[PDB]
């Protein structure tokens, strides 16, 4: 006798095939799964992805010049980041990781505040009211357990919104990634869990993280569904997050979505441009317009960041508690005198 272990592995693999709608040539390889989007929605998605590419180029530049601080590059991930944000509504709450600044910009965080985050200023994290996002999460996996609680809180108040959160391929090794999806699954909470898989965590291959042949199957441990998507495909990424959003509002619980991407022919811009051009929906001048719009907006935002007054120690003390403890009262005074 032998347990059918190899069969088991094969059987589970068959449940997680890569979802794709557009190939690298911008041709539709899956009509049945094509999402319903107006010609203007299709053009907006391309505007935002082109905008994001330029934002990445400018941010890299600005960091090298010393004009920005911490910056995690996003070029190549536009479909995964932008097309996934596109499937959301304003009611939806985003819990970003450190690299997921674009999603929260498009959700309504002003650009200059995103730059003040990068530089390390408290004001960059002073999110506007009505904008349902947290500052980027530097502790890997912490956003996953927090998203379970947001989702639960959404379900409790009866709201028709989801919590959505993002992590990388490396983050799937954390204990909190597992707890996030298992708490949400246990509570049938409305959460979308995105894992952006670019195959390396710093220097570490995904093969060193896990012997699991897809990350999406990690959903099985929670009892919830997973989808592995071509993360270089804006339509496949859109359709997956939209299906997960529907599933979640319909009280069916969370979904785990693994996007397979590459950060810098497979370029999401490449295949989407061809998709749109075949339909007379995109032109060089429309694209060159977004590029200019971006550069102008980035320049303005950088200046608005530059005119933000410096932080004082008293400011830092003031934001610790609503009512300050004796020690921080004492220290406010010491630093107020210092600052005078």
């Amino acid at each position: 006798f032998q347990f059918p272990f190899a069969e088991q592995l094969e059987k589970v693999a068959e449940q997680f095939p890569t979802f794709q709608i557009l190939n690298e040539e911008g041709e539709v390889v899956n009509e049945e799964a094509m999402p319903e989007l107006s010609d203007e929605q299709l053009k907006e998605l391309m505007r935002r992805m082109v905008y994001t590419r330029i934002l990445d180029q400018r941010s890299i530049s600005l960091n090298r010049q010393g004009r920005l601080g911490f910056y995690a590059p996003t070029a190549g991930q536009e479909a995964s980041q932008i097309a996934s944000h596109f499937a959301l509504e304003k009611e939806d709450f985003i819990l970003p990781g450190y690299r997921d600044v674009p999603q929260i910009i498009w959700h309504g965080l002003p650009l200059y505040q995103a730059f003040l985050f990068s530089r390390g200023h408290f004001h960059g994290n002073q999110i506007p009211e009505g904008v349902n996002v947290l500052p980027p999460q530097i502790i890997i996996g912490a956003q996953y357990i927090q998203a379970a609680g947001v989702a639960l809180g959404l379900k409790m108040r009866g709201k028709k919104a989801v919590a959505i959160t993002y992590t990388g391929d490396g983050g799937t090794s954390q204990g909190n990634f597992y707890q996030g999806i298992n708490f949400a699954g246990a509570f049938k909470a409305p959460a979308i869990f995105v894992v952006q898989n670019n195959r390396f965590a710093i220097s570490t291959p995904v093969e060193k993280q896990t012997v699991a042949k897809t990350l999406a199957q990690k959903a099985v441990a929670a009892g919830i569904p997973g989808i592995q998507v071509d993360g270089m495909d804006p339509l496949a990424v859109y359709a997956a997050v939209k299906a997960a959003r529907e599933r979640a509002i319909n009280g069916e619980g969370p979904t785990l979505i693994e996007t397979l991407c590459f950060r810098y022919k497979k370029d999401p811009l490449v295949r989407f441009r061809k998709f749109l051009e075949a339909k007379g929906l995109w032109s060089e001048e429309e694209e060159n317009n977004v590029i200019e719009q971006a550069k102008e907006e980035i320049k303005e935002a950088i200046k608005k960041a530059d005119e933000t007054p410096k932080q004082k120690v008293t400011d830092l003390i003031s934001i610790m508690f609503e009512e300050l403890p004796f020690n921080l009262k004492e220290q406010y005074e010491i630093y107020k005198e210092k600052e005078s």
């Binding site: 912490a142 357990i145 609680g149 639960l152 809180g153 409790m156 298992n182 708490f183 403890p325 004796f326």
Partner: protein, 324 residues
């Protein structure tokens, strides 16, 4: 009503559930079971499974659940089954909830109270009785509360739950049903950051918290027979410390000792001693000494009585100070 500490806690918790529709209570086995020590007994029956609920067995998850819920308007009161299990929950409490107000420039906040039993003298299994207040007391943006009597326990908990920033409310197991005390019915509050004199004296200040307050009062009584009048300050809150009350007393008496159940290298006694040295050395007749457990891992259950500090160590140390 004459109450035990666990009853005063349960009463605090009913009064806040009734007063505040946003108050939630959750943790392992806090719902239908009514809590491993009955502290949430009757609460789910009265208030519903949607206000008082069980979670999966995962402390880190519980911490993150409380954060999410608090981002969504609720005023979470989770429970960590024993405080020895805080190790797995440290990021969410210290790395996250303590930091959200600061981190968001006041845009979000964390009106969370974490309830956790701890403490020795009842032969519990490993990592059940560990005194870990010293760790949380080192984290900016948390307050840390340790009641010693049913009366304190109830007022401090209502305050703690009303507080719009994170509070760690630590409940000593030995003290849960060790003594009965008249605690008011209805609502009242005690301010967080305020100690009180439990026995007035003039020869030596004894500063204490948790189970060590009783050990200190019991020592004060044996010291009176020897003509040593010891004043007993129960810290109540160990972060922030009530500097005025502590300093006033040492200024009055000119001699002090600090008493804790935790190992000498742990707890908050060195903080207290440093504060006194800094603010009242001109009043000091003698070094401020510390009563504390030996610097070992918490004792195998049978060794508890020889290992834990008690009234006799307090007496011996106070006398060491008197004879300096």
């Amino acid at each position: 009503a004459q109450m035990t500490m666990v009853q005063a806690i349960t009463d605090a918790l009913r009064i806040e559930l009734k007063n505040d529709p946003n108050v939630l209570i959750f943790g392992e086995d806090v719902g239908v079971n009514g809590g491993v020590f009955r502290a949430t007994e009757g609460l789910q029956a009265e208030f519903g499974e949607d206000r008082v609920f069980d979670t999966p067995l995962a402390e880190s998850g519980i911490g993150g659940l409380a954060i999410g819920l608090a981002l969504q308007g609720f005023r979470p009161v989770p429970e960590i089954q024993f405080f020895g299990f805080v190790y797995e929950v440290m990021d969410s409490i210290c790395g996250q909830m303590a930091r959200i107000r600061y981190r968001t420039g006041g845009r979000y906040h964390m009106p969370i109270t974490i309830r956790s039993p701890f403490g020795g003298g009842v032969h519990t299994p490993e990592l059940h009785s560990d005194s870990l207040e010293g760790l949380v007391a080192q984290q900016p943006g948390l307050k840390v509360v340790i009641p010693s009597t049913p009366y304190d326990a109830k007022g401090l908990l209502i305050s703690a739950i009303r507080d719009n920033d994170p509070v760690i409310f630590l409940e000593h197991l030995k003290l849960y049903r060790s003594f009965r005390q008249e605690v008011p019915e209805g609502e009242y509050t005690i301010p967080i950051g305020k100690a009180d004199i439990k026995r007035e004296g003039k020869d030596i200040t004894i500063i204490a918290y948790g189970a060590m307050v009783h050990e200190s009062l019991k020592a004060a009584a044996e010291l009176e027979k020897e003509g040593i009048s010891a004043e007993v300050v129960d810290l109540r809150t160990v972060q922030p410390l009530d500097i005025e009350t502590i300093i006033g007393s040492v200024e009055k008496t000119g001699r002090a000792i600090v008493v804790q159940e935790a190992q000498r290298q742990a707890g908050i006694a060195a903080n207290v001693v440093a504060e006194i040295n800094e603010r009242a050395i001109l009043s000091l007749e003698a070094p401020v000494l510390r009563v504390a457990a030996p610097d070992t891992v918490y004792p195998f259950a049978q060794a508890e009585s020889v290992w834990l500090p008690n009234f006799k160590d307090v007496i011996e140390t106070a006398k060491k100070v008197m004879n300096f």
